[PDB]
Design a binder for this molecule. Structure first.
Ligand code: PEE
Ligand code: PEE
Ligand code: PEE
Lengths: 309, 308, 309, 315, 316, 316
């Protein structure tokens, strides 16, 4: 969909970190349904020889299941699903600002006209300072840009949607870092189980060992590190968003670089898309600036009239 | 695809070696998650008849789990995950300049302009006339001039490529250090003493690791692949540091071709032209037509002749 | 298809919720054949030692199967399949209002003529206040939209079908909330069974535990929360349909904004689509409404006369 | 691709029903391969014909492999074959239905005729001459003349043959016969999917017990899948019977152009026959717009007007 | 794709039968790898080579789990018939051989180049408006038609001189039919060995304690059903190949006559092609005769003369 | 894609044999992952050095199930032959080596660029109407033909000097044939060790109580069958590679002669080419001589003179 122009480097890094987090969550959930198990042995009273517990195989299985659903804490068995939910939430918000239908149509029109301006030779002719069909195409693209300027600059939906998206991402990162970090050392290999099923097996206290505890702890540490990098990138994005006021876009530098100075000050959502493209590459910003100049309009009209006469 | 011209033979070799490494990592992770266990038997004393231990099956499973998670070496347990992380790091660093937007836009522009110059017949005419052909030729000349005045000011691509190569070679050094140092610990039979006498009745257990030999063989093959990858990265560093890639020389091309006024390019332009020369010098020689001013003068003269 | 013009934001959110509920249902069904084992131990009559039940391993598996078939209720066994059926029904009924072939054609050609109005430079000229081929195209578009008005504005089929679809969605949500929340606390971890297999094992009463009980309850709670969000969105849709009478549409603000003030009052279906468009984008509504004015028709006729003479 | 215009609503519904049936078959086959087994416990009281109903656990003194052998033997012998081979029969029926529904799309004669008809319809639907006739350069005129000649060649090539209509009728007949057979045998053999099965396999020399009481864990789920498959077969048969009634209610070998010639400005379009008529009936079932746009090239008056316009714009 | 015109109804039927048999082979191999075991129990009462058959209480054999597993493995390796063990692998090999024999002429370059050139030329002649006008022009269309006439003439003198495609197709049909004969012999002969209950005398008495064991094959009936289905599909494949061979040998496919086409059309001077040209035109006739009738325009000299006259008309 | 013109019949056969061998390697690897194990039973009566053979009742070993698992693991690690354990991995490595040797000149950037240019120019010449006109004029077609003539001349003066492609193909063929020789030596020498019954003496008497155990390898028969089939495929691959090497060494492929073209066609000024261009022309002729014959017209000065004469004729 050629949406990579709109996404800056920090957004690409956030998307790739979300992909890696989703992969980690899926891998953790694969093991949490394949080999997630606890093995429990009863605490018996006091040439070495083994201790006979007088328990059947299925009594041991019953004890294991009961202690898995009672002794094992919720964060030692539900982390991969919470990680999957968090990755889904982060990935949905990542593409949300161009998936909402109004903003999607606006950004699609913006990308289309930006590509048309980039492929327009009239921009190169104006920057360096033709044909009747080329002049007609240039006039049509100028009129399309004129219609687009009134279509987008009136509203501020895209900027507000992006602000809401990054605020939601930052809040989710803060919540994940606050609640996940408190439950790191709480994951332990051994677990003391008191299932109160002595009338079925004969033992009151069972000592269990969660098999998927150390690997789950390493995956938790890796997820915490990745989400910390993600939060740092999101905080940098917030600082950039609140650094430059994106409600307006001064073309003073563009009008100074170019030979045309009749470029209006683009504001609102039209300014936000131009700022994102400038964060991507300033060439398209120069193209739009020279296509928004009235002196270029006068030059194009004069060229068309000279072609006609 | 269209960006394969910017990948020299060392880049392709590193990509394929990393693909093989990723396959090894996936196979090792599949083995470790599913099949990896540790069968343990207690030591009774620290016609033939069997030795009875009076241990239940779940007591054996508990002993196996405890001695697998306690007295087994960390490298034998987490071998393929480190390999997977290293493969992901290598894949990210190899194509980091294809994903950074500031360098990605320049790479896209360079590839498109090089392909357009290669497909143009004006190069064939110069090395040896429709109005559309002349118009497209002069537009290509103008956009080549714009590309040269836009790219030569900055050297972001060369610095990023140098950083990626340095990161890859230091990662190779770290891998070939730590994996080699921690490769003797993958052994079949590992004794364990976990002090679970209160639950089972025995102190020391003699365990066996069923996947120890296959993990050792995979580690040896991964070490060999890392050695090859590091040798290729060392060659890449030597090629980058042999000549100043920020400056390109057109002496051979201008001596072979009729035009002898081709200026030298600098910064990312020179590095990209060096990469193209390492891929195929024909593309760079064909692209060199759109840099000489004599070719522009000849094109203007032909356009004027078509006008009159 | 570009159906997003007539598809409001709440419809897209309902489709997203349906997709998420489908994913939750298939995830539950995946584990419904993975962790569905029911470990059962007999209730035996009244130094610690293990209790000997004198049961073989096959007897234990037989009791497990018997009390999985008997003790576990249907909502603890076939819950994800009912959720899958509900998600399939919701996905089928998501786009019911324009799945009807007559209304499908009406919506398709409505989007076509709206796109023609957007692309036509005569709309831009009217908003500001040309080639003869463009004038003929404008005349053809005027005749086409007049035929559209005379053909669709008389009836109200699409509005009735949309009301039917949203009422069906509301009724389905109410049924799901009533039926499914009745079995929230009914899902229990442990089940006591009396499978009457004393002639096979010797014990009459067995005590069991369901391995996929707490996880099933968590997934049920999440599914009920998502369907509650779906019902809230549906209730907001009903509130938006009832607070504003959609049987008619007035362009009074559009008449005041433009110099032309001969825009008629659109009623019936023709008003429902315009209301949906105005919710999607009021600029498209204005660009369509400047066509309905007879003053624009008179100006087009005057321009045609100037072209002819 | 472009063959979607040849499938009416009943064909699309049968395709969706076959897809759901195939999903059911895959699900049942996965259950059969993975989680299908039996758990049989011997009955020490065999006074009656079946197992007899008669605290501490009962000891049978049987090994694990004796239990496995008993389960395997009572799964092989005294379990009804419908419960064992339910998803395989469903898979075979889905393969037969998919072969029958897509037989004419792969038979070379009918596939070639359908491809030619679809290509001609695509050429006629995008032709500006049809729009002009409903409401111009000499190149467009000669293209329309070539299209008219190709339409005449198609008429004289396909109007004689009747392979497509006969093959479609045979496919519908085979499908409805298969539906009748399935509804007979599946419903007749659906009461034998029991959870509890009593087996008397006479392996006393290897185990020591005569009669065993088994339990089929997937019996209830297979019964639910069998009910779902029966409902799907019923819907499939109703759709196929509607298709057969549509084919036999009126002659599909003859197509009437009275409505089109009355609606349009041309009243000289003759009736087509055989495969042409059948394909036009299918088009009318899908969309009458294609037939209305295509009927222009079946009239000599349209050709006369086209050549008159060509002579007009030539001079 | 573009090669669908070279596959008659028998070729499509063989392809779909091969696909179904390949699915059968994959399913059987998945069952063989995973589910195929052999539950064996010893026989305490022995009166002959086979196992003897003779409140109630269970019989105790005093065998461990691993002794039972060893008995199962040894009686699976020794006294289980090879056809039941390797049934899906043979089916997979036969399907691979059939697919190779069906796609050999499409993958062998000497015949693949000729087939793709013939298909390209036939499709370029089929879409040319000159064929429609001749069966019933612009200067560019006229020169394109002349170039296509020259290309057809160059193609005819290049392909008609050899008959490699016909020889390769005949050899493929012969190999397929003899493969079907061998399969329908050996598979049918050895299909009776897939039985549920098999007795073994594997002589492991020094390890377990018993001499004879009576086993059970859980997948015996399912493998027997799959073998019956595979035999039926092989019978259908062989009948189709017999029809193909009879069609090839009934009339000489190395000699094509346009007598019906030249009688229907005005042109009665169409030459008779032979060898690979004749064989490919016979294949096209078996697919659809419209392509052959449309291609017959470019062989007639009268159409060439008319094209030359039109080119002279539009040249000046 | 369009690279099939550069792959002769032996290259296609080697590719398909490598695909089948890769499938065998994957099947063996998943068998090794899933159900590769040993079932070991101790021998109580040991009179000889190895295990000794000596109503009936079962023999009691008094061993736990995990003791049996430990014995199986130890005798699988130590006294099972390495070939029976690592057979599919060696096959996978050999298939990867063969695929790398086949696609090296496809992936080596200099040879890849040469092949891309050769294929593009050959396909442009194959569709050029000037070839048909010469072997038997629009201004745009004449300009395109002149540009194609210039491109062919530049390609000839650029590629004929270098011999990298022929050298690389020779090195790939030599590596493939010596790899085949090493495989057919070591695999055949080590194929006898894959046997069902394996006897082990691993000295775990302190843990178990017995010294010698009689093990069984359930996958030994299937691995032996797969090894035999892989040896047969390697033999076929080596025969194909030996034929390819004999074809390379029989004639100097760095010297292509157009004697047949200059003897049959009117244009007799076509000179002989050398090195990589000659080798690529030989490969194309092995694929289809029509492409080489159609490409040969651009290497003649007479055809270019006729083209420029026609250009001057239609220019004025
Ligand atoms: C992108 C695709 C891949 C995504 C990631 C996938 C990761 C997992 C992949 C594969 C593993 C599948 C098997 C996992 C088994 C784990 C162990 C386990 O669950 O053991 C218990 C398990 C459950 O028994 P119950 O059903 O409770 O018995 C009830 C009796 N009344 O044991 C058994 O069934 C016996 C062992 C056989 C396998 C069990 C799992 C079956 C899973 C799914 C079956 C349905 C699949 C439907 C889709 C099929 C598509 C071809
Ligand atoms: C000749 C061609 C060969 C093709 C290749 C075949 C071999 C494939 C290679 C490897 C497969 C590895 C599977 C590993 C599975 C996990 C390990 C394991 O042991 O699993 C056992 C586990 C349980 O086995 P049992 O306990 O014996 O089952 C109860 C009855 N005794 O196995 C399984 O769950 C079954 C096997 C794996 C899943 C198979 C799923 C098959 C699904 C569908 C087939 C039927 C429908 C087909 C529809 C087709 C529509 C186009
Ligand atoms: C770190 C990198 C990333 C790792 C990602 C791992 C993803 C894992 C995804 C899914 C697997 C989910 C569990 C599947 C099994 C479920 C049942 C279970 O837990 O165990 C069953 C059972 C346990 O093993 P045993 O039969 O006891 O083995 C006896 C001999 N040692 O599992 C198995 O047998 C194995 C199941 C997986 C088989 C996979 C087969 C294919 C893999 C590798 C073979 C080689 C492939 C080569 C490809 C080359 C391509 C060019």
């Amino acid at each position: 969909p050629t949406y990579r122009i709109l996404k800056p480097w920090w957004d690409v890094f956030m998307d790739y970190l979300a992909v890696v987090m989703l992969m980690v969550a899926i891998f953790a959930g694969t093991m949490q349904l394949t080999k997630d198990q606890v093995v429990c042995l009863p605490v018996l009273p006091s040439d070495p020889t083994g201790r006979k517990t007088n328990l059947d195989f299925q009594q041991y299985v019953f004890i294991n299941q009961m202690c898995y659903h009672l002794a094992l804490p919720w964060y030692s068995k539900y982390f991969p699903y919470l990680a999957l939910i968090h990755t889904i939430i982060l990935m949905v918000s990542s593409n949300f600002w161009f998936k909402y239908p109004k903003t999607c149509s606006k950004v699609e029109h913006f990308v289309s006209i930006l590509g048309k301006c980039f492929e327009s030779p009239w921009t190169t002719k104006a920057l360096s300072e033709l044909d009747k069909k080329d002049g007609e195409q240039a006039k049509a693209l100028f009129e399309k840009v004129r219609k687009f300027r009134a279509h987008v600059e009136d509203s501020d939906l895209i900027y507000k949607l992006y602000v809401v998206q990054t605020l939601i991402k930052t809040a989710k990162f803060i919540f994940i870092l606050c609640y996940t970090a408190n439950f790191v050392n709480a994951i332990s290999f051994e677990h003391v189980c008191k299932p109160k099923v002595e009338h079925l097996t004969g033992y009151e206290v069972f000592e269990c060992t969660h098999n998927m505890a150390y690997m789950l702890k390493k995956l938790l540490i890796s997820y915490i590190s990745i989400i910390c990098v993600y939060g740092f990138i999101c905080l940098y994005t917030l600082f950039w968003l609140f650094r430059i006021p994106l409600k307006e876009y001064s073309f003073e530098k563009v009008r100074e670089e170019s030979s045309f100075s009749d470029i209006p000050d683009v504001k609102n959502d039209f300014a936000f898309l131009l700022h994102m493209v400038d964060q991507y590459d300033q060439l398209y910003s120069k193209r739009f600036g020279v296509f928004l100049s009235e002196v270029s309009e006068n030059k194009l009209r004069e060229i068309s009239l000279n072609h006609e006469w | 695809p269209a960006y394969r011209i910017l990948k020299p033979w060392w880049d392709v070799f590193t990509d394929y070696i990393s693909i093989v490494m990723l396959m090894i990592a996936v196979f090792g992770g599949t083995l470790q998650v599913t099949q990896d266990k540790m069968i343990c038997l207690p030591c009774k004393w620290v016609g033939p008849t069997g030795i009875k231990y009076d241990l239940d099956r779940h007591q054996y499973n508990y002993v196996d789990a405890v001695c697998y998670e306690n007295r087994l070496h960390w490298f034998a347990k987490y071998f393929p995950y480190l390999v997977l992380l290293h493969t992901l790091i290598f894949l990210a660093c190899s194509n980091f300049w294809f994903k950074f937007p500031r360098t990605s836009s320049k790479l896209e522009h360079f590839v498109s302009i090089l392909l357009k110059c290669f497909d143009s017949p004006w190069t064939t005419r110069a090395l040896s006339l429709d109005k559309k052909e002349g118009e497209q030729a002069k537009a290509l000349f103008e956009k080549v001039k714009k590309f040269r005045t836009h790219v030569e000011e900055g050297d972001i691509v060369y610095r990023l490529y140098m950083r990626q190569t340095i990161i890859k070679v230091i990662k190779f050094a770290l891998i070939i250090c730590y994996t080699v140092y921690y490769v003797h610990n993958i052994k079949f039979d590992v004794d364990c003493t976990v002090d679970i006498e209160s639950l089972t009745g025995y102190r020391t257990y003699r365990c066996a690791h069923p996947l120890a030999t296959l993990f050792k063989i995979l580690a040896s093959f991964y070490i060999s692949l890392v050695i090859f990858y590091g040798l290729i990265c060392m060659y890449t560093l030597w090629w980058m540091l042999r000549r100043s890639l920020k400056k390109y020389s057109f002496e051979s091309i201008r001596e072979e071709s009729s035009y002898s006024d081709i200026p030298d390019v600098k910064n990312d332009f020179a590095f990209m032209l060096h990469l193209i020369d390492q891929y195929d010098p024909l593309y760079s020689k064909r692209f060199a037509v759109f840099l000489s001013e004599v070719s522009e003068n000849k094109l203007r003269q032909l356009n004027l002749n078509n006008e009159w």
